[PDB]
Every structure is written in C-alpha cells, then in structure tokens.
Design a binder for this molecule. Structure first.
Ligand SMILES: O=C(O)CNC(=O)C(=O)O
Ligand SMILES: [Mg+2]
Ligand code: NI
Ligand SMILES: [Zn+2]
Length: 331
C-alpha cells in the first residue's frame, strides 16, 4: 500500500504532465496521495493563471463576514456576522491596517504559535464564497473555471442525467481569517489555488481516520452534538493541533504559498487560517472513486447547514432514503 503513514505529498508536474487534469489526479492517487486527505501541487515553471493581478480592486465583496469566536484558545466556535459591502481594494486596505495586519514574526512556526494563542481575542473579516474566477480564459491547464462538472461525472459513471451546475468561488482573506473543520459537501474533492498574497496554513485528518475526529468533536462540543448528528457540516468548530495531539488524533499540517494548488480528497477533514491579505479560488470536483463516498456521506438535516441547489440531485440519486428528511432541513 502506497503512503501508509498518510503523509501529505507534494507534486511537481512537468508542463507535459499538466495537460490532462483527470489523469494527473489518478496518478497522484496511484502514489497514495489521497491517504493524507490533502496534497500540494506546484505548477510547472512555464505556467501562469493569468498575466497580472493589477486590475482586481473593483471586485465586490457583497457580504464580508466578521468571524467572532467563543470558547477557549484551542477549542472554539466561530459565528459569521455580516458586514456592509466593500470592494477588494477597500478590503485590502483594511487587512493592511494596524488593527488587522499580520504581527511581526520569525517564521511560519512562530506565526502559527501566535495564531493559536491569540485568535479568539480578535474578529477578522473574511470575503468568502464569492462566485467567480480569476483564471484567464486563455489558460488551458488547471483552469478551475474549465473543469469537467460533477453532474457530468455522475452521468458518465451512473448513467443518470441531473440538473445542476458547478462553478468556482473566490476567497479574500486577512490575518487570522479561519476555515473551520469540515469535509466537502457530499464528501467531494476540492481544489484550491492561492492566486496572490500571504500564505494559508492547512490542517488535515486522513480519510481513514475521520471518525476519530468526529468522536472527539462530539466530546468537545456536546450541545452542538445533541442538536445535530452531523454538526461539523455547519462549518463552525475549531480544534488546535495541541488539542488534537493530546487526544491522539492523527493529522498533518502544511503551508500553501501563492502560486500553489491544494487538493482535498473525499472525506479528508481540513481546517486552517490565512497569514495576511490573500486571494484563493476553489471548486469541488468528482472522480469515479468519489461515488462510493458520496453514497455514504453524512448529512445535516437540523437545518443549519443550508447548501446549494446542486446538492439536491446528489442526495436524491445517491441517497434516496435520506432524501425526504434532508430536504425538510433545506426547506
Ligand atoms: O480557503 C478557504 O477558506 C477554505 N477552502 C477550503 O475549505 C477548500 O478549498 O476546500
Ligand atoms: Mg476589478
Ligand atoms: Ni474545504
Ligand atoms: Zn445540522
């Protein structure tokens, strides 16, 4: 078995190898990459997502989110308070203000220490989940707006044609902006490209050990656990590496820099934070190997998780017994 310790693997495809996206995913899996839950892909040196980022300041962040924490430094939840709209140029200035800027630090490890020590005492503002793309239309390789759609994958594998579309999302971050512990909707893959700015640190649990994280989360968030049988689908809970190590949960960490891709694999729990002002683009995708994970994916039916139009068909076809109850949650 390849990669039996479930380490995060880093790949350096040549420009020739960067042509065929599906084939490269299947190659990474042949080397065991999926066992970690997360992989890094450094694009060939000839490749570019677009020519420059010089003209992005007029993109609108219609609903910036202020991420307010409750709990203790290593075990907390966050809620998102909606703020007034602002442009990316306004948000960048805010991120660089004395109130919100990255503190002085020695290296990524010192910054990580400061994040875990101090995150809860601040409320950074995140421009998340903005439909759109920063890939130039002429970029032919690994263009996250030109991938094969999950609806077409389901149709190719299972023969059933379904409604729904699959488009990317932009994320504008600042120091301490946080993504809570989660897997993707329907335990899909994700791919994330860091277009510009400061790094993003990731934490991940191997898929084969995801239920260990879930059991710890039920112990640490006991009221949330009683409220919903899949409350990590709310995307609000944080647990530090120190707490994970104290409780024997297997995980790995890695920092993504501008110009790098990350891939998350089905049922790979992940969480992380941004080091300073940045912009990422991400989208879900599927392969044949995903279908069995989609069939088994947990669902939130309490009503909190509230997700896309396109998830309907996935539940209806892959999880017909759950369909009924899950849709009660969504309406
Ligand atoms: O970048 C972020 O805030 C969160 N992204 C992801 O969870 C992802 O790409 O799967
Ligand atoms: Mg603009
Ligand atoms: Ni994710
Ligand atoms: Zn729920």
């Amino acid at each position: 078995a390849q990669n039996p310790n479930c380490n995060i693997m880093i790949f350096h495809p040549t420009k020739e190898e960067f042509n065929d996206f599906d084939k490269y995913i299947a190659y990474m899996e042949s080397q065991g990459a999926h066992r970690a839950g997360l992989a890094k892909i450094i694009p060939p040196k000839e490749w570019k997502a677009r020519e420059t980022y010089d003209n992005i300041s007029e993109i609108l962040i219609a609903t910036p989110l202020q991420q307010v924490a409750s709990g203790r430094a290593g075990v907390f939840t966050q809620y998102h308070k909606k703020k007034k709209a602002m442009t990316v140029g306004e948000y960048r200035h805010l991120a660089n203000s004395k109130k919100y800027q990255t503190p002085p630090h020695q290296n990524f490890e010192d910054l990580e220490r400061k994040y875990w020590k101090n995150r809860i005492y601040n409320s950074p503002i995140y421009g998340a989940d903005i439909s759109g793309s920063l890939f130039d239309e002429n970029t032919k390789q690994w263009n996250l707006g030109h991938l094969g759609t999950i609806q077409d994958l389901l149709e190719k594998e299972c023969g059933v044609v379904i409604e729904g579309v699959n488009t990317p999302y932009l994320y504008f971050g600042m120091w301490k902006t946080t993504f809570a512990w989660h897997t993707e909707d329907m335990d899909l893959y994700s791919i994330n490209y860091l277009h510009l700015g400061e790094p993003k640190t990731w934490y991940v649990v191997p898929p084969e050990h995801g239920q260990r994280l879930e059991r710890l989360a039920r112990e640490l968030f006991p009221g949330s656990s009683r409220g919903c049988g899949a409350f990590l689908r709310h995307k609000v809970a944080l647990i530090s590496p120190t707490v994970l190590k104290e409780n024997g949960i297997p995980f790995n960490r890695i920092t993504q820099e501008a110009g790098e891709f990350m891939v998350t694999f089905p049922y790979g729990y992940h969480a992380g934070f941004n080091h300073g002002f940045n912009c990422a683009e991400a989208i879900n995708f599927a392969t044949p190997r995903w279908i069995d994970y989609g069939k088994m994916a947990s669902q939130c039916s309490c009503g909190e998780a509230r997700v896309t139009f396109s998830m309907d068909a996935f539940v209806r076809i892959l999880q017909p017994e759950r369909y009924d109850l899950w849709k009660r949650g969504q309406d």
